Amino acid sequence: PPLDDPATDPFLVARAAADHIAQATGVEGHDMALVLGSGWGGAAELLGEVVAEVPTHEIPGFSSVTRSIRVERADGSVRHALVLGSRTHLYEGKGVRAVVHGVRTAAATGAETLILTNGCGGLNQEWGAGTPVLLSDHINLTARSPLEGPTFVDLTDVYSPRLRELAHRVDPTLPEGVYAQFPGPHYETPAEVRMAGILGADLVGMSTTLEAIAARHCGLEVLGVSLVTNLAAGISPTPLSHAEVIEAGQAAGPRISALLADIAKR
Amino acid sequence: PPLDDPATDPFLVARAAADHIAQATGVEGHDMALVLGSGWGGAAELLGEVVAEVPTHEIPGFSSVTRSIRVERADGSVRHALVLGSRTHLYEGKGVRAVVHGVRTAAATGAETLILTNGCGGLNQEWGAGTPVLLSDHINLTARSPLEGPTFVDLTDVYSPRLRELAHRVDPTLPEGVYAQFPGPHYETPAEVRMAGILGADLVGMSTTLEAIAARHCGLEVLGVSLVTNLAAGISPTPLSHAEVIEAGQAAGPRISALLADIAKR
Amino acid sequence: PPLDDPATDPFLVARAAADHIAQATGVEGHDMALVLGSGWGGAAELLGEVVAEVPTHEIPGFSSVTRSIRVERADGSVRHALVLGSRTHLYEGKGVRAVVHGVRTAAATGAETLILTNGCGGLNQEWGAGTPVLLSDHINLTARSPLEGPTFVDLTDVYSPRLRELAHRVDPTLPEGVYAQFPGPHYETPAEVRMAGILGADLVGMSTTLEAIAARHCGLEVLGVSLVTNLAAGISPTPLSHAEVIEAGQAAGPRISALLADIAKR
């Protein structure tokens, strides 16, 4: 049944998603899932040997290619990473269920670990375009929640200290920040960015927190990595050019992809 | 007509609601109404003589028991209190009309006083779990409103000085606070809690302000009382276990039940 | 097709609107457009010669009178100002598309400059009721966006410095401030007002920013002018009576329409 239909149980569709993915991939269960956001598009190429590719629109609940990858750890053991193909934003109007469907499907496949990445604007002048920042916490400014009902979930540690420790083994220099989510799709005015800051955020973007609350609700351990696309409006006196931003964004691709693939082995 | 349809006038449903109530109870008009939040389930047991109980889902506009209670005052005269059953939340996804329908039903019965109570997280460390707090003002962070048109209504004193005066005669030690309504149902993150602080809140919860605005627009005097369920996330260095919370919550039962009962007689 | 039909292209409907206007008015294109807000009702009477009046409920996508005005310039040339009739608020529940249809219809007629006016409450005590204020930036607190897709648009200078400079050649005494948009229609509680102050706003109201973001997306140069209806709740020690507000409101009429006429010539 259609995820859009309020009578529909969202987890029942995630269930059917998971069961399709297992049949189409020959992988009974996965161990971790990655949501590659703006800028990480090739961040999974060094994850490992692709085991299966599933036309994403073919999976229950969805509507480009979801990948199943054998991650090989140093001791030789293997994990199975589910790389979600698409991504649906809150701004698309498709409902919060559609925004978090990837996450709940990740869950149903048994992937206890979730890696959420995104592109965003930075409020700390110390982190320029290209800088990856670990999420230490978040501020959901969407006035939305992906949970329906008396689902009183606790968010005291949405972003697992365990996982950031493992990220800091791969690169002890990665800074940490509080990520704030705006509904988007438009960008923030300088007065809005000052606001984000006053409220305590170090980063601003238009995704991830709904996904994160959803995942914690499913009992997942969540790693959150932002790739600062460029300083937020009004932060730097000398704003980068749009071409400069896109340029600083491509430059990061190899580093960023090296990062994920390494963290994923642990 | 069903409240869910934009065509329906929510007030006409309220009217049907109050007419059902006067018929079923034999009480032609109530004088005051009480909404019992989390932790107040038994706060109306010393209120007075229960004259009638109406299964809530039987009153037009709803869908668990609504009560008419006689309040015997000092001077020997009576007052009838309507104790609204349910309490539909914004997060239930049934619409803002469903949220404030009880308040409009109460207004329709002729109540001129509304007491709203709720359970919330506290940000003042002085107010441990079990602490009742009068609302001196609120901050509605739901980006939603109960009013549907160029209905420009004044909120300069949503929480009546008169009623807080009376409550202080009953118990001059009730502190007062500014309450913030988040849409929920998830709880706030340590960063969002600090944020509520930064914005000027002393308390965070998932209800009440929509109801209060609805009420003032209907001309009622509002008294808001919160019951700190437990310090908000990240507030206390030392979290209280669930046993401590549920425990501090039950110990407060006798006090708030006596509080309302006294307040109702005035 | 109807605008609230998600499959409908909001821009096709703007186009259809621009075409109706062109034939109904005889003017092939407009150069600028004005949105008359609360208190600006007669602010376009001195603009110039009314070349045509089109009942609004008659232009595609709408549902009082939309005006086509010839503006005579210093060098003798002329410009055409499309003065939008109506004005649909976010609160009416019609959808964000109907809120910014006016703007999109203006752009489609070829207008390049847009003057957004509104009445609002003020947080600065030096700007009492009747004071016109220019917007230097805004804070959109509605959790909504007029944009429906990966439409990533830069909002670093929503309110054109160019125009604000012209605004100041006309009247060098106009102060500037940051505008906060609440979804409304209920007004703000004293704490919500302090909140807006802490967040960086000098003015609070129920419109403008979604339109502005919409204009900026269409490539329009935006000039935003508020008229302080009166001080925000809890700001002034001695609040004005509603009689004093409406009065201060009308006494500003001639200055306000002189202002727009002079600005319209440039």
Ligand SMILES: Nc1nc2[nH]c(I)nc2c(=O)[nH]1
């Ligand atoms: N809101 C918001 N979203 C973003 N997404 C990206 I990539 N960069 C930004 C940014 O600066 N602000």
Ligand SMILES: Nc1nc2[nH]c(I)nc2c(=O)[nH]1
């Ligand atoms: N938002 C919110 N609602 C609550 N309800 C209760 I009981 N405790 C809380 C809390 O800490 N936050």
Ligand SMILES: Nc1nc2[nH]c(I)nc2c(=O)[nH]1
């Ligand atoms: N939100 C808001 N809108 C307004 N519109 C006008 I006229 N005055 C106000 C005000 O004080 N607050």
Ligand SMILES: [Ca+2]
């Ligand atoms: Ca597993």
